[model samples]
Each structure stands twice: as C-alpha cells, then as structure tokens.
Target: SRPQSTLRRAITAAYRRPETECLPPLVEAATQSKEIRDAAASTARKLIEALRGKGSMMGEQFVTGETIREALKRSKELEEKGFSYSYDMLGEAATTAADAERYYRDYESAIHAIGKASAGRGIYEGPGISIKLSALHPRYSRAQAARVMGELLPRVKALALLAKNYDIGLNIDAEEADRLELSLDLLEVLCLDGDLSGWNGMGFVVQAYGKRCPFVLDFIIDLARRSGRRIMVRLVKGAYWDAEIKRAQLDGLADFPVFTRKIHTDVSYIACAAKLLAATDVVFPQFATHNAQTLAAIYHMAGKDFHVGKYEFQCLHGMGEPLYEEVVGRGKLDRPCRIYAPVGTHETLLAYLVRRLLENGANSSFVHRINDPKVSIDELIADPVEVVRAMPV
Candidate 1:
C-alpha cells in the first residue's frame, strides 16, 4: 500500500509538471468523458472551418480544390526560398464502405489532378501523395478490408505506377497500433502483387514507437530480398501516442512497456537505422524530424559516402518551415530533403486541426500562447514535430 501510494504520487506529479506535464492531463481529459472530448474536437473543427471559409494558409485551412494548386504554388515559393514538399491526402478512420470508396475516389482524383494540373510548365517536380489503408475501407473485418483493398488497390497501384513513370513518389501511411498489422499485410500485397517492385519510387512509413517495429523492419527487408527489390522506409516516432498508452491501460496491460523511457525509444530508432544502414541490399531511409540534435545524429550516421538519392529528411508540412528551409538548403549541397504537407476538404481538415489544438494545449508553451491567436498558428505548425522529437521510447 505504501509503494502504491508512492507510485500514485509520482504519476500525479508527472502529469502536473513542466512542458511534458500537460500531457497527462490531456490524456486524462481524452478518456474522462466522450462528450467533453467531442466538445474539444468540435471547437477545433469550428475554428478550422472558419479559417477555410476565410481562405487563409496562416491557419493551415485552405480549400480542397485550391489545396493542391495553392500548395504547389507554395512549394515553388519554398523552392525560391530553398525547400521541397510532399503531400498527404488527409483522411482517416472511415466507419463505412461508402466513405472509404469516396476517399479512394478523392485520392485517385488527386493523382489525376496532379498530372493534369502540372502538365508541361515543370515549374517544379510537384508533391507525392501519402495515403492510409484504413481510409480505403473500414478494416473491421479482414476479408471485408481485403475486398475493399481489392477494389481500391488497383487504383492506387495504377497511380503509383504512373507516379513512378512520371518521376513522382508515393508513400503508404501508418495508423493506429491495432490496425498496423493489417495495414502492413495490405502494403505487402500492394508492393508485391501490385508489382510495385519496391524500387519503383514506393515507400511505407514505419512508426518507431511500436513494440514490434524492429520485427516489422526485418520482415520488410526479407520481403525485399526475396522479391529482388529495395524497400524504402520513412521513420516516424508516431502520432497516436496518447491512444496507444490509454489502450494499454484500459486493457490492463503494462502501458507501452518499451515507451516507459524516452531514451529507449531514441536508442531503438537509431539502432533500427543502424541495422538498415548495414543491410547488404540497398535500403532507402527517410528520417522524419524537427529536432536538430536527432537529425544531425541520423545524418552523420548515413555519412557523406552514402548516396543522397537513397536517403532524405522528411518534415511535416506546416510545422517547421524554417527547419525545412535549413535542411533543404543543406540538401542542395548534399541530399534531398522534403516536407509532408496535408491536404483535404474543409471537414476533414477540421479533424486534423483539432488534433493540433489538443496537442498544443497539452504543451505549456503552446498553451500559454492561447492568449494570442497567431500563436495558435505557430502551435499548429510546431507541436507535432516537438511531440515526435520528444517521443518517449
């Protein structure tokens, strides 16, 4: 009983202290009441909707029709300032087949739109699309999800094949821990059966925070070897940190045993990278980060002797333009660095916006900025990077 009391005190203190202190409160708030959580989400949605109707990029709320074109224009502007952009279609967690199908159409339309919209001028290489498999269908049933993939995979594969033909790249995204295994199974099908050849400008994101990520990477390597293709992996600390921990607690499991220490996560990430770097077969790696120290470490390990085309730095779209500018500018002297910019209609964008607000409010600095609206823009742009960088291993 004494130890339990001590542990409780420690946990309570952990949640009420420092920049990270707010995380516990935010996580607690998320699980407290569905209505309260929904209300927070509603507030974020309303703010984003208002920003979109006003046609402002400062709020990260551009119209879907205008999103691609405007983002391309912004890419050009960034290029002039020294930067490159990668686009994410921005939809996830579909509850119905129709919604999933509609998402596929939206994705397919984005691909077609890119080709048609960017015809000839060649002002830039444009942006590559990032997609989540769950957005293709509700994976509530493996067979049903597989069927949805059967219908949607061909379309995406065709687009990926086209993107390769056009020199554009396509990346599959990562989602919840529960959905990861299925997502990966579909990824394998898309890569192998779809004839993606792994080397065909195709990549899939790997969330380093997962308990099974190292095994996942090993599997990917073996698959690449057997298929005679080189696989590209984009490393992210992950976005579902709160959900992951909560799920672990509710299930009466130890809370992300591996994440109990941040240092462990950092070491695992670097260790995984080292293993990939040593593979006899070619392995393309993209490090998604905003931390100067972490980026520098990864970059140093990849070394000057490595092929720049095989490695790149990826930064989230709006979060760290300055960091991207610095990295992309450095890339001109050495490698190819890129940005992950999200695009979607007003409604979907709202979800992303709320995530930003909740994420920011949980950080004291960002929360303190609430008195100023412009600071909200800055918070939206930087919190994810900070969160990913500080990922508790």
Candidate 2:
C-alpha cells in the first residue's frame, strides 16, 4: 500500500512563504480544523523552535555532525565500511562580510581538523572537504567581479594552500546558473595559479542539468591539459532546478539555463560522464547520483579495461544505502563510494535541508519516484537519450 499522506505538499508550499505572509488556503484550513488544528499549531511551534536548535527535525541522518570533532568521530565508522567522505560545512550563501568571514573561518577549521584526522591520506584522494565559494565572499555576484578577484581569490588561494599542505582534496561546490561563468573564471585562475600549480586535490563541481555542461567539461579538460595536473570533477544532476527556473521567469528570460525536462538532464549526465571517463589522464571523475540506471549506464560506458580506482561513485550520506549496498556490499563493483555529508547545527541547516526537501519532493525526481510502487522498473530504467529523442523538439 502507498504510505499515508499527511498533505506534505500543501504544508511544504506554505512553509516556503515569509513568516509575515498569510498562510495558503489549504494550510490555513488544516490549522483551523476543529480537532487537529490545535495539535498542528503546537507541532508547528515546536518545529519553529527546532529550527532554532531547541529540537531536532532530521537528527543525524543527512548531517554527519554538528562540529568538526563530531564529524571526525563519525567518519571512522564510515571508513571502516570502505567508504570515504567529502564534508560540507552546512550554511547558505553569505549576505554580509562578517557572515562570509565566519564561514571561511569554519571552513579553514574543518579543513585542518579533517586533514589531521586523515593523516597520511596521500595527495590526490581520500576523505576531504567541499567549500562553497559563495560562502567565502559577501560580494560574489558577477557585478562585483573586481571585488571577487581582489577579496575572494586571496581567501580561496589560502584555503587551497592549506588543503595542499594537508594533502586533502578541496572541491569547489556549484551554485546558481548565473554564477557559471564566474565560477569558471575562478576555476581557471585557481587551476593555473603558480601557488597551486602542482596541486592534485583541487577540483570543481559540474552540474549536468545546465545547458552548458558539455562546454564546461571542455573548459576543464582544456585547463587540465594546459596546467599538466589532474583535476577532480564531481558530476551532479544539480540541486537548484526550482531556483533556476524561478529566476529565469522572474527576470523575463527567454529560456532556462537548465534543461526543462528530467530526461534531458539525464542524457546530459551520461554524455558528460563519458567525456570525463575518457579524459582520465586529465580529469578524475566523481559520478554523483542515486539513480541505478545512470550508474549502470556509466558502468557500461567505462568498459572492460576500466579500473574503478580512476573513477568513483558518490551518494548522500543517509539516502542511497540500498543502492550502494548492492554496488559495494555485494562486491559487484570495485569502487570507492564517497558520501557527501553535510555537517553543522540546526541554525546552519535550513538552506541545505530546504534544498534536499525540494529535490526529493519534486514530482519528477528519481528519488521521489523510486519510492512509488506505481512506477515501473522499466520506466525508470529507460534510456534517457532515447526518451529525449522521442519528445517533441
């Protein structure tokens, strides 16, 4: 039987509003109900309190730890299970200079702690940290390119040096589509910097959903060739679809920077994965997904001579356990499974949690569909390229 519905869609939609805004009709009705309304209001109060750190909404499922010490403690168990991790300090894009500085401090502290914890962890790999460039500078917008280069680049270079010294990987996380060119600029500068000229742990994420993904891969490959250093590229389907679409609509843009259809994104993912796998000499590919079909497709594309060590699979900490259990536990594939674990307090979790919820709750999401028995396995496994071809152009 399908799971009981708590009208989560309605509640979530309401939750996106400003606290000062009136509740949507459906949500208002639920809160004004005769019997459950009082209970609902009480629960809502607790939830608000929890968001402030008084209570727990998600526990340690998605977030591995509240502090660096806690994350290090938890990582031992994961390492014992043949899994490595890329820790993300849970926080949103900075709005103020103080916020940005605080985030940078937290990131630097986490990097040092993680490096110490994973001592003797060689240069190119093992447990490392992922940093959001936006979190390191208050003015990350393209309009402030001069400030970004002057203020942000120096901070990033310092972090890069620290990561290099500790022999730990530092992946630059992706954000909105508008930041694509800006991020590429940063990546180019960092990759070619004399200070980080020979560093191997430095990397950047490429969102496959973006229309310019292939071009992005081309740029990375070109840079890698020019720099003569291997670059780690994390290939993700993307997390900012809703925001991307909304931004384009609000801005009166003609089209979205991302694919409008899920299949197109999947197609782009496989295509980009093939390119990365083929460029193993220049790029180290980290394939991040929970979709079995996507994994299978990449596995086949990797071919008979492929070594799993050259490429790896990544999944969220809490989700995709079963998928990985089969891939790693059953020994069907010889690969390192990296968990993208976020670590921070409830106060720092709202943005990350909201993104995860938006991703998993979206109607067309693979994560959402996999749980629905009504959807057929064949449907889920259909070749995304073929599906795209069948759609009207």
Candidate 3:
C-alpha cells in the first residue's frame, strides 16, 4: 500500500509538469558525455525536423490529414465500420480578423465536402462538423460580449446556414469555463434566428466537471423549450483541468472552476447524463466517454426503451477502438458511435495532441489504467458513486 501510494504521488507530480520540462533533465547526462553528446544532439535535431514535417507522430495518430479531401478519403473505412464522424478542422483561437476569416473559409469548405460525401447516405442523426467560437473571432472575451455578438454571430450564422443547406449538423464545441456563458448566448442567438430556426441539427457541448454543469443543462432545456427546436448536447468530462488549476493559483482565486478530484467529475458525469436522458423530449443526448463504467451506467439508465439511433455514443479517432468494437460490434448493442476526428497538418496538431495526452496520460484516467494489464477489470468498472463514498474523509 505504501509503495502504491508513493507511485501514485510520483505519477501526479510528473504529469503536472509539461512533457518538454520533464524530458530534458533525463537527457542532460547524455548531453554532457563527449562521446554521446554529439550523437544525442544530432538525434534531437532529427527528431525536431521530423516533428516539423507533415507526417510526424502526432499527425499520424490524431489528425486525419492536412486537407478536407484527404480526410474524407479516410472516412470511408469508418463509415464501413458503422461509425459516423464529427470533423474538427484543427486550428487555434484566432488572434486577428484575417485569421478568423481564413478559419471561416476552411470550415465552409470542410462542411461542403462532408455533406457531399454523405449526400445519399441518409444520416439523419448527424455526420457533422464541430466549430470553435474562439477560432471565429479575434476578440472572444466576455468583456467584449457586445462586440463578439455583433462580429462573431454573423460568421457562425453563415456557417449554420451553409450546414443547413447541405443537411449537416453543426456543433459549437466548448472551450474554457469563462467562455461558457458567452457560448450559450451565441447558441441562443442561432436557435432564435430566422435562418437556423426550426433546425434540429444544431448542437453544443457541455463539460461535466464544471461547478455549473446542472445549471448549464437547465439553460439548454429552457432554450430548447423556448425556441421549440431540438438541441443536441454532448457531455464530456472537461478538458483544461490543469490550466484551470494553474490559472486559479496564479490569479489567487478562491476556488477552481473544475472539480479537483477525478472521481467527483465521474459522479458529475453520471448525474448530468441522467438529466439529459430524462429531457430527451427536448434534448438529444450524446454520451462521449471511453470509460466502460460510464458507458454501462448510461446503458443501464436508458433501459428497454433504448433505440440504437435515437441516442448515440462518441469516442476520439484513434482511441477506444477495441472498446467500441465490443459495444457496437456484431450482435452487440448495435448503436451508432461517432468519432471526433481531427484534421490538420503537423503544425496545427500541437495544441490538440497535448490536450489529448493530458486527458489520457493522467494517472487517474481510465484510459491510462485500461491500457495496463495489471489493473483489474473490477476496478476499472467500479461504480463511481460507491468509489466516491469510499474515499477517505
């Protein structure tokens, strides 16, 4: 028990630091040795050069390709496997109006291609595209809410209109907790607009780790009722946990916006999933998780009325292949599982890849544990509520 405790502490400490910071010291001794230093330096230079190339490690695993056409070419195999896709054109938050306009064009082209590819496929649920509001405007801060609404809303509406024309779903991907309210405002604007009104294909993501998750769900339900349009909500255990904690510490904030413990987020996810399932009359719930326990919990909660296509499951592109096979395989649940596929070059993958690594590589992650043969299946599928109860006071 003591050894296990020590290992856990070490893992947490290592994960808190960036990968670059963690790797350099181990290589320092090799660098100091005259015989190996030259070779090590040469190897390092080659590695850096390869990373800058289009087919680097991160690009090959996570990104589909550098262009929409290339990505669609790869989607054929996924479609054959009974999986749909939500393509994310990988890029960072815009810092200039020119950057925003450029991202808009990229999104438009990607949407058109995906729509054409799936034209006769008859995918009513969604084979959609995800858009980041932060990437659609230069100034996406809450303080500039009025300016954002004036400038960013039109760009979003244009994209929404194009998606509607082509019969494709449009999901507004979630970012930081501070931007949550602003994103909701934009969603409401789009929902009520003449162009997107009565469009049930519009969607938004909600992070279960946030303190305001229930409130967010309540707002979505209310918006759906008021607009009389069905809204699709994807529930994810939040990203940005490390950044949220560091930012709070740096700013001397009294509380963090996300749950400090992973188990707390797990309990929160189940609770949010229940709420979403109960509100299916207005909200289309999309459960996005790689954890078996969470999946089992949702499946159990859905009960006999579960229709395969009515509700859906989602996983990232490269991760969770075997798990999904078991869940959606032959004579299995026969459900539709969507892959959150990212498409971009090596340069655009750095941020996306880092976030994914932090999510899965963390010591507490199920994705991390399930990969190790030593961890018991019982532990992996343990009930989160009971796990939280067993936590020491």
Candidate 4:
C-alpha cells in the first residue's frame, strides 16, 4: 500500500520549520549555481537515461568496474587491518528487460571476479552487490514491473545462490515512492520462495524516512511468520529525498511522504532499530550509517550482552573509515562489521562518481565536501591506507 498522506504532511511541515527551513534554500542554490547545477542536472539526466535502458548500450566503454575492483581490494586490506566489506554495484534504474538482464549478468560477473580475487584470502564475507529494482525494470505499472521481475527472478535467484555458495551476499536496494510496493513484492517473492535462503541470506533496504516503512516492516514480519523464514532488513535514512519531494511537487501532490527534519528521520531510524533489536527471531538489522551517535545508541541499547552476529554495521566503501574501524573492532559481536564496496571499470567509475556526487549533493553534504578540503579528498580517495591514516588519530 502507498504511504499515508497525513504522515507526509507532518514530515514536510516539520522540515520547513526551524533550522532546516534553510535546507530548501541550499537545494535552490545548488539548482541555481552553474557548476553545481550543471553536475546535478547531468547526473539526473544520466540516471534517467540509465533508467530508460541506455546504460548497458554504452556500459562497456564507461562503467566503473576497475575503480570499484581496486577499491574493494583495498577494503580487503582494511579487513586485514580489521574491517569488513559490503559491495554495492554503482548503477542506476534500468527501464528495459534487456537492461535489467545486463545488470544481472554484470553483477554475476562481478561476484565471480570477487570470489576469484579473494579465494582463501580474508575475514571479509563479501564484496556483495546492491541492486535497485527500478534499474532492473522501471514501474510502467505494477503488472509491468512484476512481469519483468518474473523473468529476472530466476537469474537473480541463481546469482544469489551462486554467491552464497561462494560466501557472497546480495542486498536489494530501494528506490523512490511509486516503485516501493513493486520492490517489496519482488523482495517478498524472493524471501518466501527460498530465493534468498528465506531471507536469512537475502536482505532488503528500508528507508526510515518513508511514511510506509512501519507498514513495510509489519508486512515483512507477517510474511516471515507465514513462511517460517527469517527476514533481513538493512535500514537506511534514505536516498532520493529531493527527487521524491520534487516529484510530489511535479505531480501537484500535497504532503511529501518523508520526514522534513533530519532529527525526525533519525528518531524514526533509532525507533525502528529499537524494535528490530527487540525482535531477534525474524528481524536481522543491518544499520547503514555514518552517524556515530546513532550507531553508538544502537549498541548501547542492545547492551553488552548483545551478539554482534545478530546485527552488523554497514558503511560505504569510500566514506566513514573511522566509524567502520570502531564497529568492526567492537569484537563483542559474533557478526563482523561490513563495508559496501563498488567495483567497475572507468566508465562505470565515472557513472559511480557522478552518482556519488548527486547523492552527496542531494543530501546537502555536498556543500560540506566543497567547504571542507578533507571531506572532498576523502570522497574521491580510492586508497584505503591513505583514507584510514588521513583520519584524525
């Protein structure tokens, strides 16, 4: 079901008042400035093109496979230095069946390479792939997306089973509003049919800022109960905030369905975490964040008695090294901390770089990157040692 409108109104109102009212101004600034505007517009266009099924046509010449491979290799070195990796393939939405198939093949090929590269090598479990359903097949309609998914499912299932056979995990990425239901439907199918080891090995990303998140959790829990399978949920504050809001504006819809205030979203995240921590039977939480306070709070609430294997911290490949080390070094948990590493060739790297810039810029962190020299280099750094050492000791 779609998110409730009442909740969206509250969230939008909250974001407009106090402190963050200034956020839209910054967004406007980015839109208005030639440099930032040009970059973001280009990213949006490329992303739309990718979603429209143009990515694979030009992928061979432009993808980021090599840069990603090098980054993950460095992440493995970090695992040697006591860290873990969670690899996300850096691509956007695919609008065609051919495009989606290409994504699956590229993903499978990437996983095979990771296994070959890391065989008998380290403590890290993966260099996993993060997939967005919209990229697999955009939402022409529920039926359309589902039809594409039906065709894609077996290949993805084979990929997942093969990855698990090689000890690599697969995580499904979330997209904007209209696609969420279709994404969940596909996720439920995978989880129920043993496609993802009944959710034990398969995982889904949930955006806390979404008005429907609580319901999504409820549905998953109910499905887990009915199917007798564990459900793994990777919680994120969210991506696509600006696009989502603007989309609402474009549609002339009132009440955007996301939290207006960062703190509200943070509250929602921790609240969801508390509930997941309490429900260990079916809820396996992957806390994906760079926020030190939020992560520490989760650890504190779970107490020293908590098992690390029950929950793990996930961070991006190039960002949040300090937090990554602390989480991995906690040592109290049976589950190791994980880092999402993306691998691809130069063309993909450019696409990935552009996406990172868009995500970073969209979240309002791009301003910080521009203002802080360290943050800027840190965003672009591919070397793990340099990234690690450059941090304040």
TM-score of 4: 0.69
lDDT of 1 by residue, 1-393 (tens): 652344334433432134333233222211213343234344333433333343133345332234666655556666555445567677887788788778877777776655554453221234566777767765533555556556756766776766655555678888777666566666666667645553345677887666565556766766666656566678776666667778768968633522544433454566566566666365567777654444544555554575545677777655545444545544333445667777766667776666555444444322224334555443333322234445564
Kindly list the per-residue Cα lDDT of model 4 for residues 29-86, writing each as its tens digit.
Answer: 1112244323433433332232223113233322223554565555556777555665
Clashes in model 1: which pairs? 259-393, 262-393, 265-393, 319-381
Q: Candidate 4 regions off by >4 Å?
A: 1-72, 95-98, 115-127, 138-143, 194-199, 330-335, 349-355, 358-393
* Cα lDDT computed for each candidate against the true fold: 0.57, 0.73, 0.73, 0.57
* Candidate 2 lDDT: 0.73
Report the lDDT tens digits of candidate 2 across residue range 83-176: 7889999875788989999999999999899889778675434688999988887867544777676788888889999999888889999998
Q: Per TM-score, what order, best first?
A: 2, 3, 4, 1
TM-score of each: 0.69, 0.82, 0.82, 0.69
Candidate 2: residue 216 Cα off by (Å): 0.8
**lDDT tens digits by residue: candidate 3, 212-249:** 66667777887788888788899998778888889879
